[PDB]
């Protein structure tokens, strides 16, 4: 309780520094926004949202969207999340009727690499996305996404189980918004709902006025922040072995969404209960590791904790560490 509020207070001390690390990212991103818009295949390129951190802070995430009419999806080998694209200026990227991720992605690179070599002032360099490093500290991941305005694919029909939490009316309204395809067969694309993830986090209560007044302060955002921070701290400490580096804040974010579904009432996230809500988040994540199952929140048959993605040994390792931390009141938080 008191230890975790001290952690949150420390994290806030870093906020008047993102304000200068994110401001520098953004100006490099609008500079590419223009050059892409000058290429004939990336003319309807824009930004998705305003406008994410995997490290919470030197990793920054920006997604470039791109409207593509006449979309058509073919599910790669009933993997639920991976698709080929079929149907214009994008005809240069197709290999036999289907849209080639690797071709479209590889010209994305050339155009950006052509540009970071022309910003002579700031020392930006290049190193599922393209990673830039602005002036030796803060990097950014730039992801290209295709936008489709059609109904969501069949593998999402049982996902986004927010009915008992955010209501069926909101689930209806969210599923009319577009969805996105990100390049990972190497010509396959992966569903992305980053835009929905952000909206659910910022409009996160059963009560429409959750966190808009002093009588309704939940600790939902503070639990996700602690969870992401727990993982970051553990990865730093276990860097002599580096067998935690398959895990990412997106696993924590997904697990936190499942816990929101389990604890749908704002009274289960009362700020006074920070210690117990955080514990709820950690034990669920723990169960995900021990069962080797972490369902993508939108695609239930897509297991992020598969053996394909993360081997058994790494999950066993993180289990033993999180288990020890939870049974000892998180000494990793000092
Ligand atoms: Zn709230």
CA of 204 to the centre of ligand 1 (A): 6
Binding residues: 50, 59-61, 141, 184, 190-197, 204, 210-211, 218, 228, 249-253
**Nearest-CA neighbor of 68 among 46, 51, 53, 52?**
46
Cα separation of 139 and 89, whole Å?
31
CA of 230 to the centre of ligand 1 (A): 21
Binding residues for Zn(2+): 204, 210-211, 218
Give the CA angle between residues 30, 141, 236 to the nearest 5°.
140
If DSSP codes are grouped into helix, strand and coil, which group holds residue 174? helix
Experimental method: X-ray
Cα separation of 202 and 207, whole Å?
13
CA of 162 to the centre of ligand 1 (A): 15
Do the beta carbons of residue 234 and residue 321 sit within 8 Å? Answer: yes
Cα separation of 199 and 212, whole Å?
15
If DSSP codes are grouped into helix, strand and coil, which group holds residue 310? coil
Binding residues for Mg(2+): 59, 61, 141
Binding residues for 2',3'-cGAMP: 61, 141, 184, 190
CA end-to-end span of the chain, whole Å?
A: 13
Q: Dihedral angle at the C-alpha atoms of 35, 39, 42, 46, nearest 10 degrees?
A: 30
Length of the chain as a residue count: 334
Domains annotated on the chain, with CATH:
14-150+179-192 (3.30.460.90), 204-333 (1.10.1410.40)
Print burial letters for 226-235: b (CB count within 10 Å at least 16), e (below 16). bbbbbbbbbb
Cα separation of 143 and 62, whole Å?
6
CA of 121 to the centre of ligand 1 (A): 42
Query: Positive or negative CA dihedral for 63, 67, 73, 76?
Result: negative
CA of 231 to the centre of ligand 1 (A): 23
CA of 217 to the centre of ligand 1 (A): 5
């Amino acid at each position: 309780a008191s230890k975790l509020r001290a952690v949150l207070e420390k994290l806030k001390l870093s906020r008047d520094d993102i304000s200068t690390a994110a401001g520098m990212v953004k100006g490099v991103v609008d500079h590419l926004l223009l050059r892409l818009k000058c290429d004939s295949a990336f003319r309807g390129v824009g930004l998705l949202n305003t406008g994410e951190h995997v490290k919470i802070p030197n990793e920054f995430d920006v997604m470039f969207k791109l409207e593509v009419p006449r979309i058509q999806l073919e599910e790669y080998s009933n993997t639920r999340a991976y698709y080929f694209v079929k149907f214009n200026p994008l005809s240069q990227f197709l290999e036999g009727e289907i849209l080639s991720a690797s071709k479209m992605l590889s010209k994305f690179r050339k155009i950006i690499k052509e540009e970071i070599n022309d910003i002579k002032d700031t020392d930006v360099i290049m190193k599922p996305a393209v990673t830039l490093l602005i002036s030796e500290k803060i990097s950014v991941d730039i992801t290209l996404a295709l936008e489709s305005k059609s109904s969501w694919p069949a593998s999402t029909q049982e996902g986004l189980r927010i009915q008992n939490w955010l209501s069926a009316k909101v689930r209806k309204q969210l599923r009319l918004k577009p969805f996105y395809l990100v390049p990972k067969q190497e010509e396959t694309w992966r569903l992305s709902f980053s835009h929905i993830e952000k909206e659910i986090l910022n409009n996160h209560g059963k009560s429409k006025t959750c966190c808009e007044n002093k009588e309704e302060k939940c600790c939902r955002k503070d639990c996700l922040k602690l969870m992401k921070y727990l993982l970051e701290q553990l990865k730093e400490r276990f860097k002599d072995k580096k067998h935690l580096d398959k895990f990412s804040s997106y696993h924590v974010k997904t697990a936190f969404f499942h816990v929101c579904t389990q604890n749908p009432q704002d009274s289960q996230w009362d700020r006074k209960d920070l210690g117990l809500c955080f514990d709820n988040c950690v034990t669920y994540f723990l169960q995900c590791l021990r069962t080797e199952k972490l369902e993508n929140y939108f695609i239930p048959e897509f297991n992020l904790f598969s053996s394909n993605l993360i081997d058994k040994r790494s999950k066993e390792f993180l289990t033993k560490q999180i288990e020890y931390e939870r049974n000892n009141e998180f000494p990793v938080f000092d």
